[PDB]
Coordinates of C-alpha atoms in Angstrom, one line a residue:
Chain A
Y401 CA 130.8 93.4 68.3
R402 CA 131.0 92.7 65.0
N403 CA 127.6 93.5 63.3
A404 CA 127.8 91.4 60.1
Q405 CA 124.9 92.6 58.3
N406 CA 124.9 96.8 59.5
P407 CA 128.4 97.5 60.8
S408 CA 127.1 101.5 60.6
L409 CA 124.8 100.2 63.5
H410 CA 126.0 98.5 66.7
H411 CA 124.4 97.8 69.9
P412 CA 121.5 95.8 68.8
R413 CA 119.5 97.3 71.2
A414 CA 120.3 101.2 69.9
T415 CA 118.0 101.4 67.1
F416 CA 115.1 100.7 70.3
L417 CA 116.7 103.8 72.0
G418 CA 116.3 105.9 68.8
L419 CA 120.4 107.1 68.7
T420 CA 121.2 106.3 65.8
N421 CA 122.0 109.8 64.4
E422 CA 122.8 111.4 68.1
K423 CA 125.7 112.8 69.7
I424 CA 126.1 111.5 73.4
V425 CA 127.9 112.9 76.0
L426 CA 126.9 111.4 79.6
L427 CA 127.1 107.9 80.0
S428 CA 125.6 106.2 83.9
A429 CA 125.6 102.2 84.0
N430 CA 125.2 99.8 86.6
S431 CA 123.9 96.0 87.2
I432 CA 120.9 96.2 85.3
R433 CA 119.6 99.4 84.4
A434 CA 121.6 102.1 82.4
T435 CA 121.5 106.0 81.4
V436 CA 122.7 107.7 78.7
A437 CA 122.7 111.8 78.0
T438 CA 123.2 113.3 74.3
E439 CA 124.5 116.1 73.3
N440 CA 120.5 117.1 72.0
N441 CA 120.4 117.5 76.5
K442 CA 118.1 114.2 75.9
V443 CA 118.5 111.2 78.2
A444 CA 117.7 107.6 77.0
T445 CA 116.9 105.6 79.7
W446 CA 116.5 101.5 79.4
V447 CA 117.5 98.0 80.8
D448 CA 119.5 95.1 79.9
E449 CA 118.8 93.0 77.1
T450 CA 117.8 90.0 78.8
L451 CA 115.1 91.9 80.7
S452 CA 113.9 93.5 76.9
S453 CA 110.5 92.0 77.2
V454 CA 109.8 94.4 80.5
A455 CA 111.6 96.9 79.1
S456 CA 108.2 98.9 77.7
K457 CA 107.5 100.6 81.1
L458 CA 111.4 100.0 81.8
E459 CA 112.5 101.6 78.4
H460 CA 112.9 105.8 77.3
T461 CA 114.0 107.0 74.5
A462 CA 116.2 110.1 74.4
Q463 CA 113.7 112.8 75.1
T464 CA 113.3 115.9 77.2
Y465 CA 109.8 116.7 78.6
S466 CA 108.5 119.8 79.5
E467 CA 108.7 119.0 83.2
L468 CA 112.5 119.0 82.9
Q469 CA 114.0 122.6 83.1
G470 CA 115.4 121.7 79.3
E471 CA 118.9 122.9 80.9
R472 CA 122.4 121.6 80.9
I473 CA 122.5 118.5 82.8
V474 CA 125.5 117.9 84.9
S475 CA 125.7 114.2 85.8
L476 CA 123.6 111.3 85.9
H477 CA 123.6 108.3 88.0
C478 CA 121.0 105.0 88.4
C479 CA 120.9 102.3 90.6
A480 CA 119.2 98.9 89.5
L481 CA 115.9 100.7 90.1
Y482 CA 115.2 104.2 89.5
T483 CA 117.8 106.7 87.7
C484 CA 118.3 110.6 89.1
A485 CA 120.0 113.3 87.3
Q486 CA 122.1 116.4 88.7
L487 CA 121.6 119.8 87.2
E488 CA 123.2 122.8 88.0
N489 CA 120.8 123.9 90.7
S490 CA 118.6 120.9 90.7
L491 CA 118.4 117.1 91.3
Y492 CA 115.7 115.1 89.9
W493 CA 115.2 111.4 90.3
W494 CA 112.2 109.0 88.6
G495 CA 111.7 105.5 88.5
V496 CA 110.9 101.6 90.2
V497 CA 109.9 103.5 93.7
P498 CA 111.9 101.6 96.4
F499 CA 110.5 98.5 97.9
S500 CA 109.5 99.8 101.5
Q501 CA 107.7 102.7 99.1
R502 CA 106.0 100.2 97.1
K503 CA 105.1 98.5 100.5
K504 CA 103.5 101.4 101.9
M505 CA 101.9 102.7 98.6
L506 CA 100.4 99.2 99.0
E507 CA 98.9 99.9 102.4
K508 CA 97.3 103.0 100.6
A509 CA 95.3 99.9 98.1
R510 CA 95.1 97.3 100.8
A511 CA 93.3 99.3 103.0
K512 CA 91.4 100.6 100.1
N513 CA 91.0 97.4 98.2
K514 CA 89.2 96.5 101.8
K515 CA 86.4 98.8 100.5
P516 CA 83.7 96.4 100.5
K517 CA 83.6 95.7 103.8
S518 CA 80.8 96.5 105.8
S519 CA 80.8 99.5 108.8
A520 CA 79.7 99.0 112.1
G521 CA 76.3 100.3 110.7
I522 CA 73.3 98.6 108.8
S523 CA 74.9 98.9 105.7
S524 CA 72.5 99.0 102.5
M525 CA 71.8 95.8 101.1
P526 CA 74.5 95.2 98.0
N527 CA 72.7 94.4 94.2
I528 CA 73.8 90.8 93.4
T529 CA 73.5 88.9 90.2
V530 CA 75.1 85.8 89.4
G531 CA 78.2 86.5 87.4
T532 CA 78.8 90.2 88.2
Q533 CA 82.1 91.4 88.7
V534 CA 83.0 90.2 92.0
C535 CA 86.8 88.6 93.3
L536 CA 88.2 86.7 96.5
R537 CA 87.8 88.8 99.1
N538 CA 91.2 87.9 100.7
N539 CA 94.0 90.4 99.6
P540 CA 97.1 88.6 98.5
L541 CA 97.9 91.4 96.4
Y542 CA 100.3 89.2 94.4
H543 CA 99.1 85.4 93.4
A544 CA 101.1 83.1 91.2
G545 CA 101.2 83.9 87.3
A546 CA 103.2 87.4 88.0
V547 CA 107.0 88.1 86.7
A548 CA 109.1 90.2 88.2
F549 CA 113.1 90.3 88.5
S550 CA 114.7 90.4 91.8
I551 CA 118.6 91.1 91.7
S552 CA 119.7 88.8 94.8
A553 CA 122.7 86.8 95.2
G554 CA 125.2 88.5 93.3
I555 CA 123.1 88.0 89.9
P556 CA 119.7 89.6 88.7
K557 CA 116.7 87.3 88.0
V558 CA 113.3 87.2 86.6
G559 CA 110.5 84.7 87.5
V560 CA 107.0 83.5 88.3
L561 CA 105.8 83.2 91.7
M562 CA 104.0 79.9 93.5
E563 CA 102.3 81.5 96.3
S564 CA 101.1 84.2 97.6
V565 CA 102.8 85.7 100.5
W566 CA 100.3 86.3 103.5
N567 CA 103.4 87.6 105.6
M568 CA 105.0 90.4 104.2
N569 CA 108.3 89.5 106.4
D570 CA 108.3 85.7 105.2
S571 CA 110.6 83.7 102.7
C572 CA 108.9 82.3 99.5
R573 CA 109.6 79.8 96.5
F574 CA 109.7 81.1 93.1
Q575 CA 110.0 79.6 89.6
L576 CA 112.4 81.0 87.1
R577 CA 110.9 81.8 83.7
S578 CA 114.1 81.7 82.0
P579 CA 113.8 82.2 78.1
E580 CA 116.0 78.9 77.7
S581 CA 112.8 77.0 78.7
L582 CA 110.3 78.8 75.8
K583 CA 113.1 77.9 73.4
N647 CA 114.0 75.9 89.4
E648 CA 112.2 76.1 93.0
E649 CA 114.2 78.7 95.0
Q650 CA 113.6 80.2 98.6
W651 CA 113.5 84.2 97.8
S652 CA 112.8 87.0 99.9
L653 CA 110.5 90.0 98.7
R654 CA 112.2 93.1 99.1
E655 CA 113.9 92.4 95.6
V656 CA 110.6 92.0 94.0
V657 CA 109.5 94.5 91.5
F658 CA 106.0 93.1 90.3
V659 CA 106.3 94.8 86.8
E660 CA 102.9 92.5 86.5
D661 CA 101.3 96.2 87.5
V662 CA 97.6 97.0 87.6
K663 CA 94.7 94.4 87.7
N664 CA 96.0 90.9 86.5
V665 CA 95.2 89.3 90.2
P666 CA 91.8 88.4 89.5
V667 CA 90.5 86.5 86.2
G668 CA 88.3 84.3 88.5
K669 CA 85.3 84.2 86.7
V670 CA 82.3 83.8 88.8
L671 CA 80.0 80.9 87.0
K672 CA 77.5 79.9 89.3
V673 CA 75.7 81.1 92.3
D674 CA 73.8 78.3 94.8
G675 CA 72.0 78.3 97.9
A676 CA 74.1 81.2 100.0
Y677 CA 77.3 80.3 97.9
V678 CA 79.6 80.7 94.7
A679 CA 81.0 78.6 92.1
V680 CA 84.1 79.7 90.7
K681 CA 86.8 78.3 88.7
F682 CA 90.3 79.9 88.1
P683 CA 92.4 79.2 85.1
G684 CA 95.2 76.7 85.4
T685 CA 93.9 75.7 88.8
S686 CA 94.6 72.0 88.0
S687 CA 96.2 69.4 90.8
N688 CA 99.9 68.5 90.8
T689 CA 99.2 64.9 89.9
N690 CA 101.0 63.1 87.2
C691 CA 97.6 63.7 84.9
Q692 CA 98.1 65.9 82.3
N693 CA 96.7 68.7 82.1
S694 CA 94.2 68.4 79.1
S695 CA 93.8 71.7 77.5
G696 CA 91.9 70.4 74.1
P697 CA 88.5 69.7 73.2
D698 CA 88.7 65.8 75.1
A699 CA 89.8 67.3 78.3
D700 CA 88.9 65.3 81.4
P701 CA 85.2 66.4 82.7
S702 CA 86.0 64.6 86.3
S703 CA 89.6 66.5 86.6
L704 CA 88.1 70.1 85.7
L705 CA 85.4 68.8 88.7
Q706 CA 87.9 68.1 90.9
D707 CA 89.6 71.3 90.3
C708 CA 86.7 73.7 90.6
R709 CA 86.3 76.4 93.4
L710 CA 83.5 76.5 95.3
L711 CA 83.2 79.5 98.0
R712 CA 80.8 81.2 100.0
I713 CA 79.6 84.7 99.2
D714 CA 81.0 86.4 102.3
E715 CA 84.2 85.6 101.3
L716 CA 84.3 87.9 98.2
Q717 CA 85.2 91.7 97.8
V718 CA 83.4 93.8 94.5
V719 CA 85.0 94.7 91.7
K720 CA 83.9 97.9 90.9
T721 CA 82.7 98.7 87.1
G722 CA 85.8 100.2 85.5
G723 CA 88.1 100.1 88.6
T724 CA 91.2 98.1 89.2
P725 CA 91.6 95.2 92.3
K726 CA 94.7 96.9 93.5
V727 CA 94.8 100.6 91.3
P728 CA 98.2 102.2 92.1
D729 CA 101.6 102.2 89.9
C730 CA 104.6 100.2 90.7
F731 CA 106.5 102.9 88.5
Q732 CA 107.5 106.6 88.5
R733 CA 107.4 107.8 85.2
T734 CA 107.3 111.6 86.0
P735 CA 110.8 113.6 87.6
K736 CA 110.3 115.5 91.1
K737 CA 112.6 118.0 92.8
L738 CA 114.8 116.3 95.6
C739 CA 115.0 119.2 97.5
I740 CA 118.2 121.0 98.3
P741 CA 119.5 124.5 100.2
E742 CA 119.8 127.6 97.9
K743 CA 123.7 128.1 97.4
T744 CA 124.3 124.1 98.4
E745 CA 126.6 123.7 95.4
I746 CA 126.8 119.4 94.9
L747 CA 130.1 118.3 94.7
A748 CA 129.5 114.6 93.5
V749 CA 126.2 112.4 93.7
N750 CA 125.4 109.0 93.9
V751 CA 122.8 106.8 93.9
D752 CA 122.5 104.1 96.8
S753 CA 119.7 101.8 98.7
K754 CA 118.9 104.4 101.5
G755 CA 118.4 107.5 98.7
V756 CA 120.5 109.4 97.0
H757 CA 124.2 110.7 98.5
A758 CA 125.8 113.8 98.1
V759 CA 127.9 116.5 99.5
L760 CA 126.3 119.7 99.9
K761 CA 128.6 123.1 100.0
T762 CA 127.8 126.8 101.2
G763 CA 130.7 128.8 101.9
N764 CA 133.5 127.6 103.0
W765 CA 130.9 125.0 105.0
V766 CA 131.0 121.1 104.0
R767 CA 128.6 118.6 104.6
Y768 CA 127.8 115.1 103.8
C769 CA 124.2 114.1 103.6
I770 CA 122.0 111.3 102.1
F771 CA 118.7 112.0 100.7
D772 CA 115.6 110.2 101.6
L773 CA 112.5 109.5 98.7
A774 CA 109.7 110.4 100.0
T775 CA 110.0 113.8 102.3
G776 CA 113.0 114.7 98.8
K777 CA 115.2 116.2 101.8
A778 CA 118.3 115.1 103.2
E779 CA 117.3 111.7 105.6
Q780 CA 121.1 111.9 107.5
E781 CA 123.0 114.9 107.4
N782 CA 126.3 115.3 109.2
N783 CA 129.0 118.0 109.2
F784 CA 133.1 116.4 109.2
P785 CA 135.2 116.6 112.3
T786 CA 137.8 117.8 109.9
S787 CA 138.3 121.2 108.6
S788 CA 136.0 121.9 105.0
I789 CA 138.9 123.9 103.5
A790 CA 140.6 120.5 103.4
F791 CA 138.1 118.4 102.3
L792 CA 137.5 121.3 99.5
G793 CA 141.3 121.1 98.8
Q794 CA 143.1 122.9 95.9
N795 CA 140.8 121.1 93.3
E796 CA 137.2 121.5 93.6
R797 CA 136.2 119.0 91.1
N798 CA 138.2 116.0 92.2
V799 CA 135.6 114.7 94.9
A800 CA 133.7 111.7 94.1
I801 CA 131.0 110.1 95.7
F802 CA 130.7 106.2 95.4
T803 CA 127.9 103.9 95.9
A804 CA 126.7 100.3 94.2
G805 CA 123.1 101.4 94.5
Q806 CA 121.9 98.5 96.6
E807 CA 124.6 97.2 98.9
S808 CA 127.9 98.2 99.2
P809 CA 129.7 100.6 101.4
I810 CA 130.5 104.4 100.5
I811 CA 133.7 105.8 99.2
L812 CA 134.1 109.8 99.5
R813 CA 137.1 111.4 97.8
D814 CA 138.6 115.1 98.5
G815 CA 140.3 117.6 96.7
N816 CA 143.8 116.5 97.7
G817 CA 143.5 113.5 95.6
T818 CA 143.5 110.3 98.6
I819 CA 140.5 109.4 100.5
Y820 CA 138.3 110.5 103.7
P821 CA 137.7 107.4 105.5
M822 CA 134.1 106.4 107.0
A823 CA 133.2 105.6 110.6
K824 CA 130.5 106.6 112.7
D825 CA 130.1 107.3 116.3
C826 CA 127.5 106.2 118.5
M827 CA 125.7 109.6 117.9
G828 CA 125.5 109.0 114.3
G829 CA 127.5 111.1 113.1
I830 CA 130.8 110.7 111.1
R831 CA 133.5 109.4 113.0
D832 CA 137.0 111.5 113.4
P833 CA 139.0 109.6 110.7
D834 CA 141.8 107.2 111.6
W835 CA 144.4 108.5 108.5
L836 CA 145.6 106.4 106.5
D837 CA 148.9 106.8 104.9
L838 CA 147.4 106.3 101.3
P839 CA 148.8 108.5 98.3
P840 CA 146.3 110.2 96.4
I841 CA 143.9 108.4 94.2
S842 CA 142.7 109.0 90.7
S843 CA 140.4 106.0 89.8
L844 CA 138.4 104.1 92.2
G845 CA 136.1 101.0 90.4
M846 CA 133.0 99.2 92.5
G847 CA 131.0 96.7 91.9
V848 CA 129.5 93.7 93.4
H849 CA 130.5 90.2 92.7
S850 CA 128.7 87.2 93.5
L851 CA 131.1 84.3 95.3
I852 CA 130.1 80.8 93.3
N853 CA 130.5 77.9 94.2
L854 CA 128.9 77.9 97.8
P855 CA 129.6 74.5 100.0
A856 CA 126.0 73.7 100.9
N857 CA 125.6 77.1 101.6
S858 CA 127.8 77.9 104.3
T859 CA 128.4 80.6 106.2
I860 CA 130.3 82.6 103.5
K861 CA 128.0 85.6 102.0
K862 CA 126.5 85.2 98.7
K863 CA 128.0 88.6 97.3
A864 CA 131.1 90.8 97.8
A865 CA 132.1 93.9 97.1
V866 CA 135.5 94.5 94.6
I867 CA 136.9 97.5 94.5
Chain B
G668 CA 72.5 63.4 95.9
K669 CA 75.5 61.9 94.1
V670 CA 78.6 63.8 95.7
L671 CA 80.8 64.0 92.6
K672 CA 83.8 66.5 94.0
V673 CA 85.0 66.6 97.7
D674 CA 87.5 69.7 98.4
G675 CA 88.3 70.4 101.7
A676 CA 85.5 70.9 104.1
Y677 CA 83.1 71.7 100.7
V678 CA 81.0 69.2 98.4
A679 CA 79.8 69.7 94.6
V680 CA 77.0 67.5 94.2
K681 CA 74.5 67.2 91.6
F682 CA 70.8 67.7 91.7
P683 CA 68.0 68.0 89.1
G684 CA 67.8 71.6 88.0
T685 CA 71.6 72.6 88.1
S686 CA 71.5 73.9 84.5
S687 CA 72.5 76.4 83.8
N688 CA 70.7 78.6 80.6
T689 CA 71.8 76.2 78.4
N690 CA 68.8 74.1 77.3
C691 CA 70.1 71.1 75.8
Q692 CA 69.8 67.6 77.7
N693 CA 71.7 66.3 80.3
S694 CA 74.0 64.1 78.7
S695 CA 76.8 63.7 81.9
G696 CA 77.9 60.7 80.8
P697 CA 81.1 60.5 78.5
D698 CA 80.2 63.0 76.0
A699 CA 79.7 65.5 79.0
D700 CA 80.2 69.1 77.7
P701 CA 83.0 70.6 80.2
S702 CA 80.9 73.9 80.2
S703 CA 78.1 71.5 80.9
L704 CA 79.1 69.9 84.1
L705 CA 81.0 73.2 85.0
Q706 CA 77.4 74.9 85.4
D707 CA 75.6 71.9 86.0
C708 CA 76.6 71.8 89.7
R709 CA 75.6 71.8 93.3
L710 CA 77.7 74.0 96.1
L711 CA 77.0 72.1 99.7
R712 CA 79.5 71.7 102.3
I713 CA 80.6 68.5 105.1
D714 CA 78.6 69.8 107.7
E715 CA 75.8 69.9 105.5
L716 CA 75.4 66.4 104.7
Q717 CA 75.6 63.1 107.1
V718 CA 77.6 60.3 106.2
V719 CA 75.3 56.8 104.9
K720 CA 77.3 53.5 105.9
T721 CA 78.0 51.1 102.6
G722 CA 75.9 48.3 102.9
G723 CA 73.8 49.5 105.6
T724 CA 69.6 49.5 105.1
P725 CA 68.0 52.6 106.5
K726 CA 65.4 52.3 109.3
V727 CA 62.5 53.7 107.1
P728 CA 59.7 51.5 107.8
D729 CA 56.1 52.1 105.7
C730 CA 53.3 54.1 107.8
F731 CA 50.6 52.2 105.4
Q732 CA 49.0 49.2 106.9
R733 CA 48.9 46.4 104.4
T734 CA 46.9 43.4 106.0

């Protein structure tokens, strides 16, 4: 880094974070997210430089809200989706909710988005005027024209979609909104989509006429894929726009209430809340994975390995080691560590002696009795997601792998 | 009715009185305003109009005696 213009300031996103005159002590960095805790017990959370345009909801300056207790944050972790922080006796997480959580929230929206549908009883006649705020009855919930980031294939990407995914388990084809275009169709999966377009923005289909028992509506940019140029100037072809209009029946529309958003909920958690942990359970180490948040809980001479679920706030999967807890605690209390990538990688557990604790699961579901490794004690372990490249015709070799 | 658009099972056909609140004269030729043709359409479907074969005179005799 050589900032010729201003050598006193580095990391050109730093002035966005407001950390030009602050002392920082804690760092948490991964593929796309970033968080730094400063001497002012203030945590700044932000994204990569590439996703700067979406940082409005994805970047936070260093500030401790009244929701936070204001105490000394013990440590931090952050995945590609959300940030978790560790106090002495508190674990607080916030950020974009997991894909399953977003889907189940959409269920609370998609069902309620079916509000205009009448019941079995004699419903009252709706007040209808030509040009009133209504949209399409069907619930794609996401049409072409929304840009979001998917971090699959070992390389993060941000792009727009092309068709609405009717089946929430089927693949789809998108188009990247690469910055160089302003200065490729890909068959993807919906697990990695964030949908940063947020509230509304789905209905822009201005209702333009009502005739017979039908409505005439044209969405912007509904021209066909023919080689004819989409003339947006004053000399636009009337016949092309004639062939590109939409004619629907009034039964195929749902009412857009005055001031009522078509979807409503937020695909982002801006507020902290408690990751439920029992009393006196000292947290040996923390890490953020796809299933939730990893932890090692202690009470007396009792050591447990747990993964905490987002929705309930408690440890979804708790297990007691088959070996004695005194060995795992070891001589050095702090030398324990938990390692995970955040979305897709095996976990690593590090105990006091300096070496590693093997992991395997029995058919019951608990931790297998470990098979010892003859490894010497380890000091640092770097874990990362690396995508193998130049795959011949998308062979059976997997796209991504873990580097340890 | 001159069906100017056919899209799937739906058709856009023009009829007199299809104009919007605009009172401008119906200039549907080369100088047709896009808003004019956009708000001066009539909505029908395929199952609402029967096809008339081109070049075939419909059987419409006059019911008025002349001789």
